[PDB]
Design a binder for this molecule. Structure first.
Ligand SMILES: *[C@@H]1O[C@H](CO)[C@@H](O)[C@H](O)[C@H]1NC(C)=O
Ligand SMILES: [K+]
Ligand SMILES: [K+]
Ligand SMILES: [K+]
Ligand SMILES: [K+]
Ligand SMILES: [K+]
Ligand SMILES: [K+]
Ligand SMILES: [K+]
Lengths: 227, 214, 214
């Protein structure tokens, strides 16, 4: 059916312009009934409406955003877009695109997005991209603790979010806990991924964490081994 | 006197929502007592045109007579009618509005239709109808046997053309499509003309009436 | 401008329980209110439209009720997949607005953490910084106290915690505490300890290591 997918710059510097693109599949942006919407979720907060646009060119934007807001529609690529100018850190957010269907009997115009994309993170700061270092969290020589041991990987000093971590290329998922990153006092992020496994298995089984920091193009596979 | 609508809105009553029929009948009234939130109205979802105007123009009525403008059992030789929809149920069975007729294809086709009514009565006649907007192209073909359609309605004081807009809406009463409702007052001696090749919820019952307590 | 006030802001309930989330707008909005479900990293999903209408794919346990200035989302037999943050949304005035959200978590029995300590890596150590990590694995409730001790001295201001979201299978939380120190200072001390207090532990659990000694 309809698929909406947001794409954009993960990192933008302040006073610069945010550009964001929703790729729509399954339906034509040329419709006269469907409308297109942007919504955003600031870190730690709820949902804030940005605005709507109709192919007839009728648009409406959130007053809070003053006049830094532009949307357009590209019939050629079946996409719509958002432009936000004079960006501050207060514009750091996950950005959602969404479709709605004009329905004046149960909704004010362009006001009921009902098919949303998964969203895309946009960080506004002047800080520089940086990839992470990955270090092993070795299973301790103190084994047979509950018959269960713990190991993992530390992914430190990176920017911007996000990073993804996997184990044994997807073959190890049970018992994995990949933590949300923290913002260190350096301005850089750090996170860890851990996994509990049978102590019985430390000599035979191999464990590897696959880390991926797309914004720095860093892909790292770190062998984690018994101490 | 007053007209009581029980659990029904003006829309549910005047369209004939199947749950709005036990109403105590009245040929005259001075006001309409209706609940702040009626539970029975547009059992099939859609937008009701000029609705507050209709409530006001029907609030006080000196004469009100229902009549079969387009007799159901005799006026539609080349079309069939829906047997009913779940959102408009009565006694655990799918039904529909008493005052409209959901015309659908017959023998795998939906012929062009053209229907006129001359108001030879000596009072205004209130006519109501609807236009169906199916949620997808498969329902459009299934009922009307063509991807697009036209509905036209014309009088000496009313003229409008309608085009079904096929699109999936959020469900309301389980329905992803819509029926938009329209009405007009046909004056003594005027003629109303319906033309369609699909998507028409036709009038079945209309109302000769005398607006005003005077 | 229409301000949407939801209650409560967070709640914990048992599987099978009936949950009620309430929404009040700053003015009457008729039935122009919708409810959404949002799980971290997933697309928001419209569950209820126009106050009371279930959407496709949404289980019948979900119900919406109310009109005007009071609305209620009801989840009748809470299931583990219902873990999410819920939002009401008004569609009555031009700037569409959402309530602040209501986070739904699962109530379960007390479970004590399993505790693990990780010394800094030799690889890391080559770069001048040392990270010591403490793991509290699969515990409930979320509240826990984790204190770092270096040569028996309590640390403060040099550690950061992070917690996972509730597990899908066991409804537990996991947590890490990372102690950050210069290499120079790490090499001046011997005994690194993570001390854990939690409702499931009858006294604090300490995991510790001796620098240099595996
Ligand atoms: C009428 O209202 C009742 C509630 O009193 C509701 O259960 C039913 O679905 C409604 N039916 C119609 C046809 O409007
Ligand atoms: K209406
Ligand atoms: K109505
Ligand atoms: K139907
Ligand atoms: K149209
Ligand atoms: K349904
Ligand atoms: K390390
Ligand atoms: K505690």
């Amino acid at each position: 059916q309809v698929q909406l997918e947001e794409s954009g710059p993960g990192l933008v510097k302040p006073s610069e312009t945010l550009s964001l693109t929703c790729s729509v599949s399954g339906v034509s942006v040329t419709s006269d009934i469907y409308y297109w919407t942007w919504i955003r979720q600031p870190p730690g907060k709820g949902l804030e409406w940005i605005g709507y646009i109709f192919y007839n060119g009728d648009t409406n934007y959130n007053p809070s955003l003053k006049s830094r807001v532009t949307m357009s529609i590209d019939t050629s690529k079946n996409e719509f877009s958002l432009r936000l100018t004079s960006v501050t850190a207060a514009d750091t957010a996950v950005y959602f695109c969404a479709r709605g269907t004009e329905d004046l009997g149960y909704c004010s115009s362009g006001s009921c997005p009902n098919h949303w994309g998964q969203g895309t993170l946009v960080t506004v700061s002047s800080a520089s991209t940086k990839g992470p270092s990955v270090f092993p969290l070795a299973p301790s020589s103190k084994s047979t603790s509950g018959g269960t041991a713990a190991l993992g990987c530390l992914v430190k000093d990176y920017f911007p979010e996000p990073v993804t971590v996997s184990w044994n290329s997807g073959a190890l998922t049970s018992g994995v806990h990949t933590f949300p990153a923290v913002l260190q006092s350096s301005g850089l992020y750090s996170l860890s991924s851990v996994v509990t496994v049978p102590s019985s298995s430390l000599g035979t089984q191999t464990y590897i964490c696959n880390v991926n920091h797309k914004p720095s193009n860093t892909k790292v596979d770190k062998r984690v081994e018994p101490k | 006197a007053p007209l009581q609508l029980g659990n029904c809105s003006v829309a549910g009553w005047i369209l004939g929502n199947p749950e709005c029929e036990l109403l105590i009948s009245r040929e005259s009234w001075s006001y309409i007592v209706e609940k702040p939130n009626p539970e029975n109205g547009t059992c099939f979802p859609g937008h009701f045109a000029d609705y507050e105007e209709l409530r006001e123009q029907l609030s006080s009525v000196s004469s009100f007579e229902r009549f079969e403008i387009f007799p159901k059992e005799s006026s539609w030789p080349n079309h069939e009618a829906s047997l009913g929809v779940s959102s408009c149920s009565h006694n655990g069975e799918s039904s529909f509005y008493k005052n409209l007729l959901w015309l659908i294809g017959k023998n795998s086709t939906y012929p062009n239709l053209s229907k006129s009514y001359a108001n030879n009565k000596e009072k205004e006649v209130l006519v109501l109808w609807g236009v169906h907007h199916p949620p997808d192209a498969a329902e459009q073909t299934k009922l009307y046997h063509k991807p697009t359609a036209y509905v036209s309605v014309v009088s000496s004081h009313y003229s409008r053309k309608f085009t079904p807009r096929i699109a999936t809406r959020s469900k309301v009463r389980g329905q992803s499509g819509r029926i938009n409702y329209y009405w007009t007052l046909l004056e003594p001696g005027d003629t109303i003309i319906f033309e369609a090749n699909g998507n028409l919820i036709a009038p079945r019952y209309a109302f000769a009436l005398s607006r005003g307590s005077g | 401008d229409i301000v949407m006030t939801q209650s409560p802001s967070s709640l914990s309930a048992s599987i099978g329980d009936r949950v009620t989330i309430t929404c009040r707008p700053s003015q009457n909005i008729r039935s122009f209110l919708n409810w959404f479900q949002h799980k971290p990293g997933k697309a928001p999903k419209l569950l209820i439209y126009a106050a009371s209408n279930l959407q496709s794919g949404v289980p019948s346990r979900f119900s919406g009720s109310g009109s005007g200035t009071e609305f209620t989302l009801t989840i009748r037999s809470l299931q583990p997949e219902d873990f999410a943050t819920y939002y009401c949304q008004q569609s009555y005035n031009t700037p569409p607005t959402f309530g602040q959200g209501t986070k739904v978590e699962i109530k379960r029995t007390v479970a004590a953490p399993s505790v693990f300590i990780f010394p800094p890596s030799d690889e890391q150590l080559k770069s001048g910084t040392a990270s010591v990590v403490c793991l509290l694995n699969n515990f409930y409730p979320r509240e826990a106290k984790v204190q770092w001790k270096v040569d028996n001295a309590l640390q403060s201001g040099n550690s950061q915690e992070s917690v996972t979201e509730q597990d899908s299978k066991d409804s537990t939380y996991s947590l890490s505490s990372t102690l950050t120190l210069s290499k120079a200072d790490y090499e001046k001390h011997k005994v690194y300890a993570c001390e854990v207090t939690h409702q499931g532990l009858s006294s604090p659990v300490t995991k510790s290591f001796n620098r240099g000694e595996c």
